[PDB]
Every structure is written in structure tokens, then in C-alpha cells.
Amino acid sequence: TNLCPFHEVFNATRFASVYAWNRKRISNCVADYSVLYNFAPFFAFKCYGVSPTKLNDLCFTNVYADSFVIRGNEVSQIAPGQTGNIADYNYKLPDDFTGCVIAWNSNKLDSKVSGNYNYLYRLFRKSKLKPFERDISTEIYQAGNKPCNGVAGFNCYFPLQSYGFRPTYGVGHQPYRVVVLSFELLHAPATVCGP
Amino acid sequence: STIEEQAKTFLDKFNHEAEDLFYQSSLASWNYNTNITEENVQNMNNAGDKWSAFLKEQSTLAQMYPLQEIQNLTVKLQLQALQQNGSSVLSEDKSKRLNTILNTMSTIYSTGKVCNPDNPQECLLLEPGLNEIMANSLDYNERLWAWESWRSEVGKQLRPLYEEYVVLKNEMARANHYEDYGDYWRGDYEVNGVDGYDYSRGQLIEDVEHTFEEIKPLYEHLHAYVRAKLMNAYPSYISPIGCLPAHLLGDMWGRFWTNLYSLTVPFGQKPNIDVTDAMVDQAWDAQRIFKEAEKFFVSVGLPNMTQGFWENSMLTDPGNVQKAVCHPTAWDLGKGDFRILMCTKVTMDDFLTAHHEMGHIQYDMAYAAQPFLLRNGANEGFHEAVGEIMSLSAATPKHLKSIGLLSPDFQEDNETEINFLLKQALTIVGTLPFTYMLEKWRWMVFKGEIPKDQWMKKWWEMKREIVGVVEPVPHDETYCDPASLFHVSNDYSFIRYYTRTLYQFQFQEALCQAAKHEGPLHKCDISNSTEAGQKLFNMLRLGKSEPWTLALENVVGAKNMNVRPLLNYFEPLFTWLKDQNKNSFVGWSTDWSPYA
Ligand SMILES: *[C@@H]1O[C@H](CO[C@@H]2O[C@@H](C)[C@@H](O)[C@@H](O)[C@@H]2O)[C@@H](O[C@@H]2O[C@H](CO)[C@@H](O)[C@H](O)[C@H]2NC(C)=O)[C@H](O)[C@H]1NC(C)=O
Ligand SMILES: *[C@@H]1O[C@H](CO)[C@@H](O[C@@H]2O[C@H](CO)[C@@H](O)[C@H](O)[C@H]2NC(C)=O)[C@H](O)[C@H]1NC(C)=O
Ligand SMILES: *[C@@H]1O[C@H](CO)[C@@H](O)[C@H](O)[C@H]1NC(C)=O
Ligand SMILES: *[C@@H]1O[C@H](CO)[C@@H](O)[C@H](O)[C@H]1NC(C)=O
Ligand SMILES: *[C@@H]1O[C@H](CO)[C@@H](O)[C@H](O)[C@H]1NC(C)=O
Ligand SMILES: [Zn+2]
């Protein structure tokens, strides 16, 4: 009856930092996945355990749309079994990831001449992330064997770093908005469909 | 938590902050050099200040990680570069004094001027006034006046400053655990901890001297031919067995003999191949020139220019009110931004310069994936050698024929090939004894082998002995003639111009071997050969990450700098010069001088 709010996720004025990625639960609506064919570049559109061609052929218990911003080189890390700063410490997909990854260049929106320091990412962490885990802590990373006392200094770094997007950066360093549609399959009425 | 992983993480932080801070400094420098205002100067210095202060802060923090504790050579290389970027080694008082001296000598060189003896109101700077006389005037006395006035007026000011500069730079070097400042400079070629690729600082002296011996036959015949031609034009001023007077060499110091071509041209009846006319005929512009240069690098397998290159670069003079520093330079700002600043005119000179500067960009793009601290040529001579070989290939008549600027009508006779090699030898070969002899004098002064009261005595003994050049006027120790050259008074190493010259012909012979070129090496074009492009790329992507000896091997199959490819390039001229000097005295006598 009522269309799924994909506009709210893809057309958001400002995306979340990848370290504090945004999750929107999609439920109880008709899903015109077709309307996604907007934001024409769609620099990447890769689905897993499922095919894009006629995606409307399915029914799921729940859909999760994860949104964040990274830079061009790191889009390849948004994929199962990938490795690197983003996949290790910010947003990790599982090995058997069932869903899709959509990313497009937002250099016109997320870049500034003076540098856009709104978008951050996690640079250091004691360990890797579990799939779909989120760490938003701002505790000082300890590199030495001495305690940091909640302030950055020698061998003690603030764990979160900025991209500083500028419009004249190369394609690899330009900002890209990313959406990760996860498709949940449980033993439940499976109330997300639509022709 | 080992002290190696703490350094791994310290470099992690450093790289990410450095690329952001370096970009702001690089872009502020770009905006000044392309749009000269009082405001853009402020930003350029402010961003440059925060970049320097960031580095000095990080050099201090990098020195807290003992280098010896790191097994990983990549990490050890990066920390070493950050720690030796520390001149927090002298006291604050001597550090302040040394910078003051460096600025004073720089100011004297850039602002010093001499005034004409007839008219004490008409005066001239080095650039553009005095250089104009040294490159164009055929008048003995006008050349003698400018040569002596520069040294006796500006050089004498620099003499006491250089004496204190030598002392403090040596104190800086000794406290950094080098023998002297010359030993410090030779550290750019040093390699440690890699078996079969090591290179010591003392080895550079021996390899420069060993290779220079093999140059002497070619130089002595070039010197003999040039002297014989100059004697015809200046019969009363030049001895047939003496050294060449220092003010008759084509520029202010004789660093290059390029401007002697008009008086020394072997076959002056033939033209120089100049496609400047054909380019204007076909209505080329700067865009077409750089599109053609981009096509050249694609033809060997290298990638084309990024989209931001065409958007952000300045390939023409903006003219009108907006002034720009028009010196052709290639910019690697970081974060994928690559630019070329060039006030291009539609000339063959600028068409070649485009290929040279785009060669720099190709090197910049190839090692862009390396860590920030390893994004440079393998040593100081690599980056310039890469640029030179591109203008070598693009200038050959084969390449000019294929791109349609030189019709198949033009037949290359053996005499334009001798005219071409003579002009090349005047620049490429004539500078090698000059470059070697100057840096040898500086190395000896820093080592303390030349006392202050024999500085100018030994400088002119070595000029006569090694370069075959004699001063036209005696100079006591109130002079400082080395400091009359930019690189000496502005604190730059000079041996890079010798090693780069040898590398570029080592590169070209290897790339032409991969391109299956048959014929003299000077006729070679590596266009349309992807094996040559691949062979070059394997070195380009290394940057500073591997020893320059190994990076050299990935191109040419040898671990050390070699002079044979240079002689191979100039062999046709060498056989002609030996023929030409049949009835002329080859060599020179050090005791003859033009001042009786
Ligand atoms: C310390 O380093 C600075 C800057 O070098 C930069 O950082 C390096 C790691 C590498 O990335 C370089 O490409 C960078 O340029 C040196 O400053 C430069 O000095 C030269 C001449 O001395 C000058 O032409 C440059 O403009 C300077 N760099 C900038 C950004 O203005 C400095 O010389 C080094 N100090 C010592 C003591 O070695
Ligand atoms: C020195 O350390 C570097 C890492 O800084 C090593 O290169 C990396 O090796 C790891 C293996 O654990 C790979 O995951 C990386 O892809 C490599 N590259 C980079 C840029 O990290 C290198 O192998 C080490 N050398 C020695 C001899 O141990
Ligand atoms: C150059 O800078 C001045 C400000 O100092 C500005 O008025 C002018 O528009 C600038 N020109 C360009 C091409 O950026
Ligand atoms: C040249 O640049 C374009 C930019 O779109 C790129 O697609 C192409 O692969 C590059 N190489 C060639 C040979 O065109
Ligand atoms: C060019 O070749 C001719 C014979 O083909 C020869 O006589 C002449 O000397 C050659 N020129 C030079 C400079 O060697
Ligand atoms: Zn260059």
C-alpha cells in the first residue's frame, strides 16, 4: 500500500561517517527497488546471494539499509571477505553476505574547497570488527605500554580521523556515498515484498 | 607491544596528517605561482609555516624510536627520512645564525647588481641583464666586463658569508655523525642492510672519478674543436694550446656550452630541424601539444592523464593582469591531484618541454601508491633523468615524421646528424667537467683539504686542470667565484647533474634495446613499444621504496652508474671530432692565461 522510504536513505542531505554508519530498518512496505535507478552513476552496484535483474521477485522478513560515506579507493572494501581500514575497523560485511552494495560519487555534495572534515573514519582499534558491528567510541587509542589518561600524546592517538574532502582530489580520494541493502531471511511472516 | 609496531602506528598517523597538510601547502603554492597577489603570498607562507612546523614536531617525535630496533627495512627507511629531516641538532643560536647567512647569500645573488663603467646610472641584475650578455654578446670586452663585475662586486660580498656557512654546515654534519657537509650530501646515494645492493658514501667519489676518466677523451676532443673554432673568431685572444677563457663559454660560468653553437657549428649551411613553423601551419595550440605528449606515453603502455590534470593545470599564460611564475614545473600535490604549470608557446622548444614535464608526472603517478615518505625518485638524479629521455625520443626525426610535423620529404644526411650531436655535446658533455670539478672543490673544502687562504687559488688550478678553462683576470682570496653560481650560494648539492646525465643514457639504451631499435642510439624513438614502457614502469612504481641500485637494475640490468651508454650516444661525433682535430693540438696547458 505504502512505498518503502528509500528516498529518505539515498537522498539524505548528509550521510553518516563510516565509523558511525547509519542503519535504517525497512519493514511493512512495497519495495519499488526500481526507483533506485536514480543517482545515475551508481559507480558500483554489486549484489550477493541474489541478482539485481528483477530484484522484485522476492520476499523477506526484514531489510536493513546501511548508509555512510567513504572515499573512492575504499569502496572495494565494502564486500565480503575484504580487508583494510574500513573493513577491519568501520564496517565489516559477513562472508555469506546476502544483499547489495550501492555506491556513487558525491564530490559535488560532500567536498569543500576549505576541506570537509564532517566525515570521519576509525584508524586504530584493538581488534577487528565482527560483521555488522559498530564502534562509536572516542577513547584514546593506546600504542605504547603506558596509559594515555584520556588525552592524546606520545604513543597515544585519537582513534578517529577525517577525510578532509576537497573537490580537486583525484577520483580515488573523492567522497562516495554508499548504501548496503541487507536482506534478512528468518522464520517469520516475511512482510517485505512488492511487484 | 614492540618498539617496531609502535613505529608502524606512528607512521600511520604521520602519513594521514601529512598528505592533508602537504596538500594545503602545495595548493597554496600553486595559487601564488599561477595568480601572484599579496593575499596568495600570505596563504602560501601560512600553509608552508604549518607544514614545516608539523614536520619539525614529527622529526622530534620520530627520533624517540631507536632506528636499530626495527627489522623492517620499509619502516626503517621511513623513520630515517623523518629523523634526518631534523636539524634540531645545532643550538638554537647557531641554527638561527646559519639561516640568516643562507638568506643573506640568497638575497645578494637575487638582488645584487653591477653598474656600467661609462654610466653609473645604468645597472644590471644577473637575470635578465648579465645573463643576456653572457649568452648573446660576441664582444670580448663586454663579456669580460660582465664576467669580472659579477665576481668582483657580488662575489666579494659572499666570501665572508661562505666562510661562516662552511663552518656551521660542518658543525651540523659532524653532530649528525657525518665526516663533513660533503659527506652529508653524499648520503643521498647510501644504501645499507641489503646484501648485493649496498652503496657507501665514499663509493660515490670513486665511481664519479672512475667514470669521469672515461669521459676525458671525448671532452678533450670537444674542447680542442671548440678552441680551434673560437680561435678563428678571436685570433688575438685565444692560444692554440691554452685553456679557454672563462668569459667566452656561452653563459656566466661555462656550466653549459650551448650558446657556442653559432660559432662552433660544424656544417653551418644545413638547417636545424625546427618544426615550430609546421606547428603554427597546422594551427597547433598548447592543448594539442599536451594531447600529443599524452599520446606518446599511452603508446608505450603508460596511463593517460587524469581528469583533474586537464581541469586544474595551467598550460598557457593567463596573460593580461594575472601574472604567473612561468618556469615549467610538474606538480604532484598528492591525493590524486597532478598538474603542470607552463606558459606554453607554440614552439618546438615547448613541445619537447611538455614531454619532459609529463615524464615527471608519469613518475609521480607511478609511485603514488607508495607511502608518503617514499614518493620520490630513487635518488636525486632519477627524476630528472626520466624527464630528459622523453624529449630525446620526441625530438628524433622518426617521431616528428610520424606525428606529421616533418614530412617524409626531409632526408636526414650525415651532416645534420653531426650538427645535432655537436649541439647536444655542448650542453650534455660540456657540463660534466664543470659539474664534477665544482662539486669536487666543495667536497674538498668541507673535508678541510683546502685552507681558506688557498680557496680561490685551488678553484682556478682545478678549473685549468680539469675543465680546461682559465680565468681572464687574477683573483685573490677576497673573491668567492663558486658562490657566484646559484647552487653554491643557495645551498644545493651539484653532483646530481653529473649522475643524472649518466642515468638518462643508461635508461635510453635499455629502453631502446627493449624497443628493438637498430641503428645509432641517438636516432632512437621508444614510441609504440610497450616492452620499453613496462621496463621503465617497474622502476617508476618503486619510488624510494627500494635502493637506487636495485631500481637502476630493473631498467638497465646493472647495479651501478655507467658511462658507456653516454659514449655510445656520442660515438658518431667522437669519431668526427678525432678526424677534425687531425691537425690541431688536443689537450691544454695550464700555465697559459689571457692576462700575460
Ligand atoms: C625536510 O623536508 C622538507 C620538505 O620535504 C617534503 O617532505 C619530504 C618527505 C618529501 O615528501 C618532499 O617531496 C617534500 O617536499 C625540505 O624542504 C624543502 O627544501 C627544498 C630545498 O631545500 C625546497 O625546494 C622545498 O620547497 C622544501 N619543501 C617545501 C615543502 O617547501 C627540507 O629541506 C628538509 N630539511 C632537511 C634538514 O633535510
Ligand atoms: C615490512 O612491513 C611491511 C608492512 O608495513 C610488509 O609489507 C606488508 O606485508 C603484509 C604482510 O603481513 C601485507 O599484509 C601487506 O600487504 C604488505 N604491504 C604493506 C604496504 O603493508 C613487509 O612484508 C615487511 N617486510 C618484512 C621483511 O617483514
Ligand atoms: C587572482 O586573485 C585575485 C585576488 O587576489 C582575484 O581577484 C582574481 O579573480 C584571481 N584570478 C584567478 C584567475 O583566480
Ligand atoms: C584514457 O582515459 C579514459 C578516461 O575515461 C579511460 O577510460 C581509458 O581507459 C584511458 N586509456 C585509453 C587507452 O583510452
Ligand atoms: C657523409 O657521407 C659522405 C659519403 O656518403 C662522406 O663523404 C662525408 O664525409 C660524410 N660526412 C661526415 C661528416 O662524415
Ligand atoms: Zn625536469
Residue numbers in the entry:
A (entry chain B): 333 to 527
B (entry chain A): 19 to 614
Task: Provide passages from the article that reported this PDB entry.
The trimeric spike (S) protein is the major glycoprotein on the SARS-CoV-2 envelope and is responsible for engaging the ACE2 receptor for viral entry, and thus, it is a prime target for vaccine design and therapeutic antibody development. Receptor-binding domain (RBD) in the S protein plays an essential role in ACE2 receptor recognition, and mutations in the RBD affecting receptor binding and viral infection have been reported. To unravel the underlying molecular mechanism of the S proteins of Omicron BA.2, BA.2.12.1, BA.2.75, and BA.4/5 bound to hACE2, we determined their atomic structures of the S (BA.2, BA.2.12.1 or BA.4/5) or RBD (BA.2.75) in complex with hACE2 by cryo-EM or X-ray crystallography. According to our previous reports, the binding interface between RBD and ACE2 could be divided into two patches (patch 1 and patch 2).
As for BA.2.75, there are more distinct substitutions, including K147E, W152R, F157L, I210V, G257S, G339H, G446S, and N460K. Moreover, the residue 493 in the BA.4/5 and BA.2.75 S proteins was reversely mutated to Q from R. The crystal structure of BA.2.75 RBD in complex with hACE2 was determined at a resolution of 2.9 Å. The KD of BA.4/5 RBD binding to hACE2 was approximately 9.0 ± 1.7 nM, which is ~2.6- and ~1.6-fold higher than that of the PT (23.8 ± 2.6 nM) and BA.2 (14.6 ± 2.1 nM) RBDs, respectively, while BA.2.75 RBD (7.5 ± 0.2 nM) has a similar binding capacity for hACE2 to BA.4/5 (9.0 ± 1.7 nM). Residue N477 of BA.2, BA.2.75 and BA.4/5 RBD forms an H-bond with S19 of hACE2, while A475 engages S19 with an H-bond in the BA.2.12.1 RBD/hACE2 and BA.2.75/hACE2 complexes. N487 in the RBD of BA.2 and BA.4/5 interacts with both Q24 and Y83 of hACE2 through H-bonds, but it only forms an H-bond with Y83, and its interaction with Q24 was absent in complex structures of hACE2 and RBD of BA.2.12.1 and BA.2.75. While in BA.2.75 and BA.4/5 RBD, R493 is substituted by Q493, which is hydrogen-bonded with K31 in the BA.4/5 RBD/hACE2 complex. Although the H-bonds were absent between Q493 and K31 in the BA.2.75 RBD/hACE2 complex, there are more Van der Waals’ contacts between Q493 of BA.2.75 and K31 of hACE2 than that between R493 of BA.2 and K31 of hACE2. However, R493Q reverse mutation was observed in BA.2.75 and BA.4/5 sub-variants, which could weaken the positive charge on the binding interface and may affect the binding to some extent. It showed that these pseudoviruses could enter the Vero cells with different capabilities, among which the BA.2.75 pseudovirus has the highest infection efficiency, and BA.4/5 follows, whereas BA.3 pseudovirus has the lowest infection efficiency.
